[PDB]
Structure formats: C-alpha cells, structure tokens
Amino acid sequence: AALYTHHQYIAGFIMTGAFAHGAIFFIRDYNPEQNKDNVLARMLEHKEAIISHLSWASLFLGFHTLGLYVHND
Amino acid sequence: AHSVKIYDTCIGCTQCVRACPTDVLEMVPWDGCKASQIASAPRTEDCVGCKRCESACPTDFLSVRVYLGAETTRSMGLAY
Amino acid sequence: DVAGLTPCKESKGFAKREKQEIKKLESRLKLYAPDSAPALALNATIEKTKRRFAFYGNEGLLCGTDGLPHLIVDGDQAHLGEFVYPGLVFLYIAGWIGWVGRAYLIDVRTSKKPTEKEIIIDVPLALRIMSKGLTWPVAAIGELRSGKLVEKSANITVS
Amino acid sequence: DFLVHHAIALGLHTTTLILVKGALDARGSKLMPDKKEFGYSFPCDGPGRGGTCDISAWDAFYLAVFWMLNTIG
Amino acid sequence: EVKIMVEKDPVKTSFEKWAKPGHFSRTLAKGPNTTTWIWNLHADAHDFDSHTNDLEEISRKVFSAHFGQLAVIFIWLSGMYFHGARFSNYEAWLSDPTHIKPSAQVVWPIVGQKILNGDVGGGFQGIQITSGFFQLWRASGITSELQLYTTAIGGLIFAALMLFAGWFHYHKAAPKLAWFQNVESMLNHHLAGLLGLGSLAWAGHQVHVSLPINRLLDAGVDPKEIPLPHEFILNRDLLAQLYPSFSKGLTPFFTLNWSEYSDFLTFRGGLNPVTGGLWLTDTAHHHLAIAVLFLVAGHMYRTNFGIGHSMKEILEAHKGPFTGEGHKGLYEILTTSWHAQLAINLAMLGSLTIIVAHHMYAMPPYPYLATDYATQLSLFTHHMWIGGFLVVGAAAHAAIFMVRDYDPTTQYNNLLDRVLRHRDAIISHLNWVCIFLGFHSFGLYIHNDTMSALGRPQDMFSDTAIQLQPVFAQWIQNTHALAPSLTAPNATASTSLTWGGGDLVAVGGKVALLPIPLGTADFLVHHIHAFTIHVTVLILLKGVLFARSSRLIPDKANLGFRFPCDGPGRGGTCQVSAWDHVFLGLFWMYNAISVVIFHFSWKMQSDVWGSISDQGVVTHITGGNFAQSSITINGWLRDFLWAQASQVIQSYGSSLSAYGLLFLGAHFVWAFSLMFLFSGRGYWQELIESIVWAHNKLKVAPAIQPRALSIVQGRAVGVAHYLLGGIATTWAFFLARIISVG
Amino acid sequence: MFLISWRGYWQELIETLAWAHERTPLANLVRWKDKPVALSIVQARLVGLAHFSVGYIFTYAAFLIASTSGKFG
Amino acid sequence: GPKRGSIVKVLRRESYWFNDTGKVVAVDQAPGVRYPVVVRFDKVNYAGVSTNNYSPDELEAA
Amino acid sequence: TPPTLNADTPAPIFGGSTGGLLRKAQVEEFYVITWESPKEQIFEMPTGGAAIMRSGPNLLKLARKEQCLALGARLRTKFKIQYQFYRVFPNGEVQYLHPKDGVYPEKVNAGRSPVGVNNRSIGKNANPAELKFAHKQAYDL
Ligand code: CLA
Numbered sequence A: 001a002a003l004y005t006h007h008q009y010i011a012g013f014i015m016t017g018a019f020a021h022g023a024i025f026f027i028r029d030y031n032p033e034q035n036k037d038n039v040l041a042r043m044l045e046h047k048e049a050i051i052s053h054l055s056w057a058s059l060f061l062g063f064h065t066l067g068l069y070v071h072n073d
Numbered sequence B: 001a002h003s004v005k006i007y008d009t010c011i012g013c014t015q016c017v018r019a020c021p022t023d024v025l026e027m028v029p030w031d032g033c034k035a036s037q038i039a040s041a042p043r044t045e046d047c048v049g050c051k052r053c054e055s056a057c058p059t060d061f062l063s064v065r066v067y068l069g070a071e072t073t074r075s076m077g078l079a080y
Numbered sequence C: 001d002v003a004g005l006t007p008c009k010e011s012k013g014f015a016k017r018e019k020q021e022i023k024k025l026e027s028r029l030k031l032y033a034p035d036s037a038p039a040l041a042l043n044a045t046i047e048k049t050k051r052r053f054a055f056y057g058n059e060g061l062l063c064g065t066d067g068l069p070h071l072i073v074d075g076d077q078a079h080l081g082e083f084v085y086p087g088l089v090f091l092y093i094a095g096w097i098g099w100v101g102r103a104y105l106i107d108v109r110t111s112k113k114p115t116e117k118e119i120i121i122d123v124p125l126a127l128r129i130m131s132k133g134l135t136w137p138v139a140a141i142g143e144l145r146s147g148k149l150v151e152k153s154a155n156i157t158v159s
Numbered sequence D: 001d002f003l004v005h006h007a008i009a010l011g012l013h014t015t016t017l018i019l020v021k022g023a024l025d026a027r028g029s030k031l032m033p034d035k036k037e038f039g040y041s042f043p044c045d046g047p048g049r050g051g052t053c054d055i056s057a058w059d060a061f062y063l064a065v066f067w068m069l070n071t072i073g
Numbered sequence E: 001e002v003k004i005m006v007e008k009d010p011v012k013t014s015f016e017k018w019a020k021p022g023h024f025s026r027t028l029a030k031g032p033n034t035t036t037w038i039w040n041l042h043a044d045a046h047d048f049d050s051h052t053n054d055l056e057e058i059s060r061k062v063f064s065a066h067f068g069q070l071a072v073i074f075i076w077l078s079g080m081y082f083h084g085a086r087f088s089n090y091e092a093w094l095s096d097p098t099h100i101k102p103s104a105q106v107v108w109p110i111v112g113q114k115i116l117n118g119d120v121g122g123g124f125q126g127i128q129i130t131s132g133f134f135q136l137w138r139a140s141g142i143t144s145e146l147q148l149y150t151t152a153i154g155g156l157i158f159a160a161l162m163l164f165a166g167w168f169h170y171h172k173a174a175p176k177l178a179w180f181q182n183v184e185s186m187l188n189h190h191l192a193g194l195l196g197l198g199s200l201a202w203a204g205h206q207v208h209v210s211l212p213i214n215r216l217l218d219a220g221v222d223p224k225e226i227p228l229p230h231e232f233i234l235n236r237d238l239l240a241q242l243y244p245s246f247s248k249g250l251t252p253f254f255t256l257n258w259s260e261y262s263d264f265l266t267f268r269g270g271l272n273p274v275t276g277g278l279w280l281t282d283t284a285h286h287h288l289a290i291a292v293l294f295l296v297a298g299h300m301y302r303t304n305f306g307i308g309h310s311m312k313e314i315l316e317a318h319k320g321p322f323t324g325e326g327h328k329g330l331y332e333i334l335t336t337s338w339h340a341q342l343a344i345n346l347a348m349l350g351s352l353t354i355i356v357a358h359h360m361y362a363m364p365p366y367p368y369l370a371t372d373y374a375t376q377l378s379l380f381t382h383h384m385w386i387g388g389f390l391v392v393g394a395a396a397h398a399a400i401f402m403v404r405d406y407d408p409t410t411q412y413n414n415l416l417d418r419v420l421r422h423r424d425a426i427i428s429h430l431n432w433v434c435i436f437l438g439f440h441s442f443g444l445y446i447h448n449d450t451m452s453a454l455g456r457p458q459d460m461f462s463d464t465a466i467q468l469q470p471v472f473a474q475w476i477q478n479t480h481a482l483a484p485s486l487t488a489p490n491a492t493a494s495t496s497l498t499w500g501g502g503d504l505v506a507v508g509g510k511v512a513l514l515p516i517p518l519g520t521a522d523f524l525v526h527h528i529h530a531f532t533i534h535v536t537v538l539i540l541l542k543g544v545l546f547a548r549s550s551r552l553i554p555d556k557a558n559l560g561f562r563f564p565c566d567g568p569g570r571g572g573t574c575q576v577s578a579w580d581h582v583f584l585g586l587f588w589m590y591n592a593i594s595v596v597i598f599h600f601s602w603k604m605q606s607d608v609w610g611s612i613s614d615q616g617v618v619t620h621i622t623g624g625n626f627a628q629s630s631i632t633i634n635g636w637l638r639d640f641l642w643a644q645a646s647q648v649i650q651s652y653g654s655s656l657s658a659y660g661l662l663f664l665g666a667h668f669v670w671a672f673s674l675m676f677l678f679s680g681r682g683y684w685q686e687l688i689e690s691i692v693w694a695h696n697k698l699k700v701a702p703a704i705q706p707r708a709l710s711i712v713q714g715r716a717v718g719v720a721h722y723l724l725g726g727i728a729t730t731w732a733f734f735l736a737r738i739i740s741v742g
Numbered sequence F: 001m002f003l004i005s006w007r008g009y010w011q012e013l014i015e016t017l018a019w020a021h022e023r024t025p026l027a028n029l030v031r032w033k034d035k036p037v038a039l040s041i042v043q044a045r046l047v048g049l050a051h052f053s054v055g056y057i058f059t060y061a062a063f064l065i066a067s068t069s070g071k072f073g
Numbered sequence G: 001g002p003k004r005g006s007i008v009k010v011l012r013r014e015s016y017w018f019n020d021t022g023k024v025v026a027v028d029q030a031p032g033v034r035y036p037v038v039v040r041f042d043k044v045n046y047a048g049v050s051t052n053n054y055s056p057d058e059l060e061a062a
Numbered sequence H: 001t002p003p004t005l006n007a008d009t010p011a012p013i014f015g016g017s018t019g020g021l022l023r024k025a026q027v028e029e030f031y032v033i034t035w036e037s038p039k040e041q042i043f044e045m046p047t048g049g050a051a052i053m054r055s056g057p058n059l060l061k062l063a064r065k066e067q068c069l070a071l072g073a074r075l076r077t078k079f080k081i082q083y084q085f086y087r088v089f090p091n092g093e094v095q096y097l098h099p100k101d102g103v104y105p106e107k108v109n110a111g112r113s114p115v116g117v118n119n120r121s122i123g124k125n126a127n128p129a130e131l132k133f134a135h136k137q138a139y140d141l
C-alpha cells in the first residue's frame, strides 16, 4: 500500500511538472517564425477546439458520475 | 522602478494622467491623433503599480502599459 | 448468463431481498389498527413493493451474487431495454431542446434589441419554434448538407 | 469498479483540461493578448477590464495541482 | 413641533416600472449588454440609498419594506399554526407528552420517500419536528385543533393587512422626512406602547387563561374535560376554585393591599417538579412587573406637551477631560443616516439573541421542554447562529456608514474623531491580545496532546495533573446557590438549577437539570471562546476603522465600500476594502459559533442529561467523559466527532434518512465553496472564451455576452456556499444524533 | 489561511504592527534591517499550495499506514 | 480611407473585435493621423467601450 | 519656471494622531505640502481625523508622496485651492516635485519632452524568445 501510494503521488506531481515546463517553453522559448506552419504551430492555431472538447468531456463525465452516485445514494 | 510605456495609439484622452495618484504621467505635445497631445511617463521612479492608468485608457486593447519590475521603497508604498 | 450473472427470476438472493423488506414492513404495520391511515399507507407500500419485485423478474434483468440487478450496457439485443432504448428517446428530447433553443437564438439575433429579447422572451415566436422543433433531425441534417450549420469567420484572436 | 474508473477518468480529464488551457493560453488570450511579455508567474493585470485576477499560466498550474491531488486521492 | 406629516399620493401605482426589469438605478436601466447585469441587478436591488440621494424617498422605501417583511412573517406564523392544526399529532401528544414525539409535517407518498413518515406515536406518521411549538401551545393553554385553525386564519388576515399598509403608506399616504426624524416620540411609543402594553396584555392572557388550564393539566385531568378558556372569564367562581384569591375581586389591586395576590403572583425559583419548566404563576408576575417598568420608562423624552427630556441636551452634557468634546454631534448622526442606526440595532439584537439562547436552556420556560433534548438543543443552536450573523451585519453596516455617510466638516466633535485618530493603537493592542489568547488557549491543548502522545499523562493539564480550576465561576455559582437565604429572602429558591445549589429534578425518567460542575476542561474552552470572539472583533473593528483610509491607500473612501483591490501594486492590495473585512470575519464568526455549539452539545450530553432509574442512580448519555477526554484534540476527534457521528451515517433505510442524505449534501456544498474561494476571475474568463468559440462555430452565440463573475461576487458565492455547507452539516449531525439518542 | 485571505489585509495589519513596535520604550533599542511586508500574491498562493499538499500527503500516509499495519490486512 | 456607413471587418490581431464587423462613423482626413478610421461595434469589450479607431490598412473586408 | 521656495509658514490646527511620521522620515525622504486659503474651513486629513486649515498660508508635512497628491486633489476639487509639495532629505535638501513647470500634468504645455513613448502599436512587440541571452526585454526597443 505504501509503495503504490508513494509512486502514484510521485507520478501525479511529475505529470503536473511536465505540463508546467511545456507552458514555460511556450512562453519563453517558442519562436513563431522558425516554427512556421509545422504541427507545433497548428496546435496553437486551433487550441479553442481542443479546450472546448476537453471541457465537454470533463463536464459529461462529472455530470453523469455524480448523477449515478447520488441516485444510488 | 516599474516600466511604463505609451504606445502611439493614445487619442489624448488625458484620463491616464488624471487617474495616476503619484504625478507620474503628464501630457506632452505630439501631433498625430486629433489634438497633438500624447501621454508621457518621466517619473516612473514613483509608480507603485496602481494600474489605475490602464483602467482608464479607452483604446482597443491599451495604449499605456505598466510592467512590474524591481521593487523599491517608493514603489512598495511603504510609510514606515 | 453474460458476465456470470443469473436472471433475476431465478436468483435465490432476490427472494431474501424481497422477504426481508416485506417482513420489515409488516413489523412496522403491526403497531396500528387495520382501519387507520398508517395501516392503509403501509399496505399500499407493501403492494407497491410486490408490484415492483414482480416486474424485474419478468423483464429479464440479470441479478448479482448479492441479489441486485445489473445493467448490461453493451448493445446486447436481449438487453436493449436498459441503455439503448431509453438512450434513443433521451437523445431525441435533448436534440429537440437544443435545436429549438438554437433556432430561437438565430431568429432573435436579427431584431432591433436582441439583448432585450433574451431577458424578456416573446412567447408567440418561442412557442412557434418549440412546435416546429418536432422534426429536428430531418432539419439538422438538412442544414448540415446545405452548408448552413457552421460559420467560418469566427472572432477568436490570440497575439 | 465501473463508477470509480469513471471518476478517475473525470479527474484525469479535468486535470489535463486545466494544464492544457494554461499551456496554450500562456502566450496570450483575448483578455490579455500580450501575456508573453509579462512572463510565466505574475499576480494579475489589475482590477480593470472586469477583473483579471489569477490569470497567468503559473496560476493554471497552481489550480491544476489541486485536481491532481484529488485524482490521486 | 411633533405632528403628523403625509404627502398625498406621491407615487402612482402601475405596471410600467414593473415591465422594465432594471428601473431603480439609471446605470443599468438601459439593458443587459453583458451577463454581469443580471447579477448586479439583484446585488443592488435593495440598495435604497444608492438609487437616489434624498432621505425622504429612502425612508418611505424602508417603511414599506418593513411592512412587506412583517407580512411575510405573518404568513410564516399562520402556516406553522395551520400545520399544527391539520397535520399534527397535537391532541394525542397532550394525553401523553412523555411518550409521544412531536410531529407536524407529513410527506406525500410518491417515490419511496413515504418512509420519512416515521412512527412518532399516537397513531400518527410524520417527520418529528423540533421547533418547540407543541410546548409553546401547551404553555399558552391551547388544547384543541380548533383553537389552532382560527388563529391560522387570524394570521392570514394580518398578513393581508400588513400588505395593505405597505402599499398605502407608499402610494396613497406616504410620510415625509420630517416625520421619521421624531425619535423622541418614536422611543416613547415603542417603550410605553409596544413593549409595555404588549407585556401587560400577555400578562393578562396568562393570569386569566394560561394559569387555570395549565394547572388543571398538571392535576392530571383529561385535556378534553378542561373547561374552555372563556369559562374562566365569565365565571370568577370556576376560576377561584384553583386560585381563591380571585374571590377577592379587583379590590386588592386598587387599595394597594395586593399582597393577597400571592396565589397566582408568586416569586419561586426552580422548576415545576412535574413539567420540568418554570412556574407560570411566576411568569405572570414577571410580565406584570415588566409591563409597568416599560410603561413608566416610556415617559422620559420630550414631546409637544412641555415636559420630558431631549436627546441632545442629554448627549452634549457628557463631555469629560479625556474625551474631547464629548457626545456632541451624535444626535445629528443617528437622525440623518439609516446605517448608523442599523449598526447599533443589529449589534444589540444579536447580543440579545445570544442572551436568549443562554437563558432558555438554563431556565426552561415551557412545560416538558427540558425533557425533549432535541428541541432544547435546536433552540440553542439556531438562536446562536442568528446572533452570530446579526453581529457581523452590525459591523458591516457600521463600515458602510463610515465609508459613505461620515463627513468631518461637522464631525470635529472629538468622540468619533478621537477613536479614529488612534486606530493604529487600538488595532495593535487588539492584535497583541489576540495573539496572547490564541497561544495561551490552543498551545495548552497542543501540550496535552503531545503529552498524552508521549506516554506521559502526568505532565498534562488535566484535572488530575496540573489543575486550572476556574475559581471565579465557581464562586459565582456558590453565591447564586445561597441567594434565597441571604441576598433574596423572599425568593423561595435559586433562579436556576444550574447553580451548584439545589438538587435534581425528574420528568418521568430522563433528567431535566442539575448543578453543573466546572473544571479545567471548562477553563480551557472558555478561554478558547474568548480568543475566537477577540479575533472576530479584531477583523471587524479593523475593517470599520480603516474603512476610510490607511497608510497603504490614503484615498480609499473615494474608491467606495465595495471594491476588489487597488491594483497589484504596492506589493499587492487585494482584499483591502471593508466589505472584504466582513467577508473575512464571517468565517471567524462561523468558527466561534461552531465551537460554542460543540461545547454545549458535548457538555450537556455528558454532565447534564441522562435517564435516572429508581434508587436515584443517574447515568448520563455519554457517561461523564467530558471532564477527562475534552482536554486533547484527539478527544474531540474520536469521543465527539467519530463517536457521536455514528448515528447519522448508518441512518439509511430508517425514518432518519434525510439527515444522512443532507450530511453528504452539505459536505458537497462546503467542498464546492472551495472552487470559488481559491480560484480567480481571470482563469475562468479566459476559459469561457474557448466555449464561446465552440458556440460561434455553430451559430449559438448568445447576445448577452457571457462574462465571468466579478472579483467580489466570487468571494460572496464562496463564503455563502461555505457557510451553508458547514451549518447544514452540523444541523444534520446534531439532529440525527439527538433525535435517536435523546 | 493563505488561500482565502489576501494581501491587502495583512499589509495594512503589518503597517500598524510596525508602529506599535516603534512607539514602545525598552523595545526600540532593537531595530529591523529588512522592512517587514506581507507575503506577495504568487508567494501566498505558493505557500498555501505547499501547506495544502503537505497536509494532504501526511494525513493520508498516517491513515494508510496505521489502519493497515494496525491490522495487517 | 473607406466610405462612411461602410461595413468593414477588423484585422487588428490584438483587437477584441478581431474578425468582427462594424460600420464606419467618420474617417478623419488630416495629413498626419496614424489611425483615422472610426468604427463603432454592436458588442462592448471587457472594458465596456464599443467605438475604436484603426488605420485604413488595418481593416477591410466589405 | 523657477520652482517655488519653501518658507516657515504656519501649520494647520490638529490635536494629534497616530498616523503621522515615522523613523523613515529621519533616515530617508519625507514630503511637505503647502497651499493658500481665503478663510478657515474644516478639511479631512489623509492620515485620519479632521483639521482646521488657517487663513492665508499653510504648510503640512506627511510621510509619503501619495498622501500629498491625495490631499491636493481633494483640495483642488472641493475647495478650489492650488498647491505644491516638495520632498525633503535627511540632510535638508528640498526638492520640488508636483507642479514641476507650473501647469498640472493634465493640461498640455510647451517645453515638455516625451518619455517612454513607443512609435508602434502595442500588439507589435517581438516575442520574448528571440531576445534571449540579450537583456533587452520586449518593449524597451
Ligand atoms: C397592488 C399592487 C402593486 C403595484 C401595481 C405596485 C407598483 C409599483 N411599486 Mg409597489 N408595493 C406594493 C404593491 C404594488 N406596487 C405593496 C403591497 C408594497 C408593500 C410591500 C409595495 C412597496 C413598494 C416599494 C417600497 C417600492 C414600490 C415600487 C413600485 C413601482 C415599481 C415596482 C417594480 O417594478 O418592482 C417590482 C418588484 C417585484 C415584482 C418584487 C416583488 C417581491 C415581493 C415584494 C416580495 C416577495 C418575497 C417572497 C416571500 C419571496 C421570498 C424569497 C423566496 C424566493 C423564497 C411600481 C409603480 C418602487 C418605486 O416606485 O420606486 C421607484 C419602490 O421603491 N412598491
């Protein structure tokens, strides 16, 4: 139990740090002229769709999980 | 020690200088918008970061921008 | 059958989940006279319990090792009455709501004060659109085919 | 196990939503389309323009840490 | 001078201002450009002094709003009476008040919720109420459902009446500012007329109907054979059968020989030995005395009849050396500003609610009240919460006054000015005493916890180890225990049974009250109470004093009472207004009141309540484990939370199921509050753009642009959800515990 | 404590605490070098998150070890 | 620049009204103005204003 | 214009306060504000409390600059009174600040230089990823 809990919390912190440093890269290391129309630029080109669909997925999952749990309660 | 900047979109509303409670922003003759007026920040050594300036300029995004930099006694607003 | 669950009308654990509840209700019932409002309410509750337990077994749900129904949301033809049959009618109702709301917004947007018509609804037009919103799939697919469903000049900006 | 796996999916989805929103709108958004010039972690952009508290990408990470801890819990 | 002042028909009643949603304020009457219009509409919907500027219209609106509030209260009361009449087991309760649980609410059988109608007794099935209305009706003399029906209708009538008045005095005959300002006559009439005559009328009702009916109920007769409340009015002989003093007519009262009224006008401490409540023959005398007190006290202030005091010569006359120009210029503050009056009224009413909550549990005034533990606990907790809210409201309104009604051009009167001129000292000393109290109260608990954890209990602060016996409270208890012999020769017994004197009283099994001991475990918790109260006063007083200006922001009064922050400059100025100080003080008020109610619950279940058996042996509910287990935080965790929380959690499938559901519901709401309390507006405003994009992509963009909640509304929502969750959790826990085990 | 209450209250408190220290005898012989100020905004968020995380980790490590090892399954 | 009462679509990358339409009010015809075109929009921004001035090369779609 | 010179004008009547000067004023800068009034009114102090200004000249020393500007704006708006304020060092070196050229910073004035004015639109600054290992930030250019 201790081993599992330890390693899972470490993994959570590490997965958060990966995105933190991705954001730092985007802020202070990304050159929009060299990265002209590659995949990394097209990720910024349509980020609204990505955020919208992640929003929808999270809302759907939360709504339905909470609904079923409260119904069983 | 904060860095104030006045980009060339000020229509001379004079509100930035009216709002700043430190006598930092002042008007200056500069032809080009309507009335040959523009803002100017000569006394940036006194800005605390109030951002009352930016909350007044009715431009598209903004024309006066404050960038918070090195902290001092004047900019921290201390009285002790 | 599927997933190692037995049908509920043969589950020897459903019988207990029924008789224990029945006996609890009867223990509650024996504290009054058979001609008083509590006794009538309790007898109604017992009849409702019997009517409920004599419907699950006849439907075909699979009970568990603890005597509780389990829903096979799989697509199994022998179990369409659990997920896909109610899911289709729900999707119908939800598409109805969304389509009539979208159409009301589209119609209101071309007016004098469109922001006024959103805190103060105009019931005639809203009712008209709600009525016409019965055949929404035949309208949504028609708007998709005709290229009228989506815009292209969206106003997103990022410097 | 079904319901807990769906709660786990919801947690993962919300955490990645926060982190991806931060990493993407770390260079600039409509509320503040010069965020790249201010850096990674800055408190806010004043009370004006409706209120821009808690706007940086470091704040996105700070909000996502809570959801990471909740998912791992 | 003092006269009636009315302006005939100042506002035409119509529906024009009714169709335009925003009409009171011109800033938002135009229309909802963005969605932060729907919010501030309801926000400043009741900001009467913000819409307009003249005190006259503000006063008229205040008057009519008071009338509407009174109408709503009347509807509430008539509803409670109608429910006690139609869906209650009251008549069955009257025949056996010790085995029948009160209940005045039934639930329709729709979706299986029928099981909420638990078996309360008497052939009834419904939720068991805890309002204490059954005891109040039993003490009033109400003995039949009919006598409830009528009064319900009565309430309804008054409701309509109030509404009528509310319309009238705003649309047909509204007064003018000069009329409201007559505070002398207003106080005269509220002292002599409202309180005095009200107390006299209630004393009359008591002495005429409530005494004989309740006495016959104590003699063990059937509540159906008791004569009706008017057979004692049209028959002085039928009433004199119990109190023969009535045979002497109204003569003793007029010849000053009224020492013969000692039958029904008594002075006896203690409680009635069979009902576990005060003697109504004592409350009648109390009301009779209070009535004449308020009546003779209602002749102090001057009206147009020559005599009386004036509350301006009284104020200016008090002006000492230390305190500048005395109370000068305060009569001008409390007659030209509605907020400086609301502050004092809210503070006094909250403190009075706390006093009421402390008095009622110690001197039960209704029959069979101390026996029903659930009612006696709910009546404490509810009133405590009400007072705790009202005091914070008083602080908030004092801050509002200081922000936008104070002006110095007339306030050179050095009483408010002088306290404003050493705020940096007041707050500094309050901060120091808060720190001292916090340490010397909570560090003792931490010491006890560490010692009991290190296997060395001999170094603790228990009642066996180093002792902290509160000597002053013990001396006060011993002094009040001996009062009926030395310092109160006419009172037969002490005022309460909580004093060390006296003995135990039983109501047929369960105990009502007994002398309460006070050890170290009480010393610690009383000091904790003092510490939390001090911190709350610190926050609220700091906000009130620095509402105008400070070293950080010298022109804060220009910004206003409610505003998020003055930029991220000066290091940071977030949460700098007085509204934010009220926001911060709400949490500490919640903390304080929660600690108080936990104290009361555990101490009562441990050292007061219980069920005595024959030969005298009395076993309390928990078993007297408060003196020893309440000195360590672990003890409050297991012996109070973990142990007593074992009734609500396993209440599923029983008549107490709704409490088990609302436990988790309130937990969810409390945890939901943290999303608003921790986050900030910028992240959500940015996230909303990526949803508006998906909406535009499908042509479902609303015309009312979806802006995110303002920086102040986020805090408001957070604190509201926090308080709701916490209080509802404690509500469910307390009720699910005491209903089952009490 | 660090996530609900924000800086403008604590700075206005420190400004009077400094007064109280300066205007007392027998204690103005000592003197601070660094002017006492309230924690910054992002600094307050960081300290709050650190406390939240340390508590979250500790009160669950203790529970998972005690409830298991006290019974050993 | 453009005509009065003409419906033009913005191209200013840091504008709230980017890729949105608006009708010109009155373009100033002075010699040294850097942003003479004045356009009013039917949706306020985060600050609440709906009028803004651009340069003729910064917005045109008709 | 020649900046006005300080003097020993009297001070407004005030019974004291706990929001006055501190040790910062004897080891660092501090400020002093003057004005001229035609009568004797009651004005609110920016440090808490009220004071009665005197007729003719008045001189008031405070602890920050923002205090002086707040009081001066309140004067110019409510009493229609013109004012100046200075900054004084420990060694008694007076420095004249607010009406630096007589005209307040709102009205335009000749002989004023533009400071911090960029000849471009705010949305044109280069990214912070080309000017790395080069301390030019994004906007000083
Ligand atoms: C006989 C019907 C009638 C009519 C036609 C009017 C008409 C008018 N009144 Mg008026 N009024 C009436 C009765 C009436 N009143 C009564 C009986 C009272 C006494 C309470 C008042 C007290 C009153 C005041 C004090 C004011 C008005 C004002 C107005 C004008 C604007 C009202 C408006 O748009 O707000 C419409 C408002 C509502 C629809 C809100 C109704 C909410 C009610 C009052 C409370 C219900 C509480 C309920 C229990 C819910 C509790 C919470 C619940 C969710 C659980 C308008 C001319 C205003 C005015 O002229 O100022 C310029 C003003 O200030 N009236």
Ligand code: CLA
Residues within 6 Å of the ligand: E042, E043, E044, E045, E046, E047, E048, E346, E389, E390, E391, E392, E393, E394, E396, E400, E561, E562, E579, E582, E720, E724
């Ligand atoms: C005698 C009692 C009394 C009176 C007459 C007032 C009157 C006023 N207060 Mg006030 N207040 C009071 C008590 C009182 N307050 C108390 C006890 C507190 C402490 C909490 C406050 C705290 C307070 C603050 C902090 C503020 C006011 C403000 C105001 C003014 C505008 C109020 C308004 O428009 O609200 C409109 C009403 C609402 C928006 C309703 C909000 C809904 C509440 C918060 C939730 C209710 C929960 C409910 C019990 C159950 C929830 C579940 C259910 C909803 C499903 C007005 C003069 C405001 C102001 O600027 O004054 C000029 C302001 O900022 N008050």
Ligand code: CLA
Residues within 6 Å of the ligand: E431, E434, E435, E436, E437, E438, E439, E442, E443, E446, E535, E538, E539, E584, E587, E588, F001, F002, F004, F005
């Ligand atoms: C459990 C959480 C918690 C704790 C411990 C505190 C503690 C404190 N708050 Mg607080 N606060 C909290 C949550 C908390 N807050 C939250 C959630 C809010 C949001 C509403 C606030 C809002 C708030 C306000 C608005 C105010 C406070 C104030 C205070 C202080 C009161 C002074 C006092 O009693 O000192 C006693 C301190 C303690 C009992 C802490 C424990 C100390 C231990 C027992 C001693 C340890 C011994 C030794 C030093 C250890 C050395 C370690 C080393 C060897 C490594 C105190 C520091 C007030 C303040 O500043 O007054 C001074 C104040 O105005 N708080």
Ligand SMILES: CC1=C(/C=C/C(C)=C/C=C/C(C)=C/C=C/C=C(C)/C=C/C=C(C)/C=C/C2=C(C)CCCC2(C)C)C(C)(C)CCC1
Residues within 6 Å of the ligand: A018, A019, A021, A022, A023, A025, A026, D023
């Ligand atoms: C089933 C199965 C299989 C398969 C599997 C697979 C194929 C998997 C996959 C997996 C995956 C697929 C995973 C993934 C993951 C992901 C993640 C984890 C992500 C993350 C990301 C991030 C973190 C980002 C960041 C960034 C940014 C934001 C910007 C800049 C850049 C960077 C990159 C830095 C096999 C055959 C083998 C076996 C059998 C079964």
Ligand SMILES: CC1=C(C/C=C(\C)CCC[C@H](C)CCC[C@H](C)CCCC(C)C)C(=O)c2ccccc2C1=O
Residues within 6 Å of the ligand: E675, E676, E677, E679, E680, E681, E684, E685, E707, E708, E709, E710, E711, E713, E714, E715
């Ligand atoms: C979540 C959140 C938001 C965003 C949350 C918002 C916008 C709440 C709005 C949600 C409601 C439910 C929308 C209204 C829905 C309509 C009433 C539709 C009615 C029809 C049916 C759906 C009933 C903030 O703006 C914010 C600001 C400052 C600090 C914290 C926060 C914060 O935590």
Ligand SMILES: CC1=C(C/C=C(\C)CCC[C@H](C)CCC[C@H](C)CCCC(C)C)C(=O)c2ccccc2C1=O
Residues within 6 Å of the ligand: F001, F002, F003, F005, F006, F007, F008, F010, F011, F037, F038, F039, F040, F041, F044
């Ligand atoms: C309490 C509090 C303060 C004031 C708190 C202060 C000044 C912090 C100082 C606490 C003492 C002096 C230090 C405590 C020592 C620690 C146990 C460890 C120190 C750090 C190690 C590296 C040694 C703020 O300034 C603040 C600002 C913004 C939001 C919330 C808050 C807030 O809650």
Ligand code: SF4
Residues within 6 Å of the ligand: D043, D044, D045, D046, D047, D051, D052, D053, D054, E564, E565, E566, E567, E568, E572, E573, E574, E575, E711, F041
């Ligand atoms: S709250 Fe608004 S103003 Fe105060 S700091 Fe955070 S952002 Fe800047």
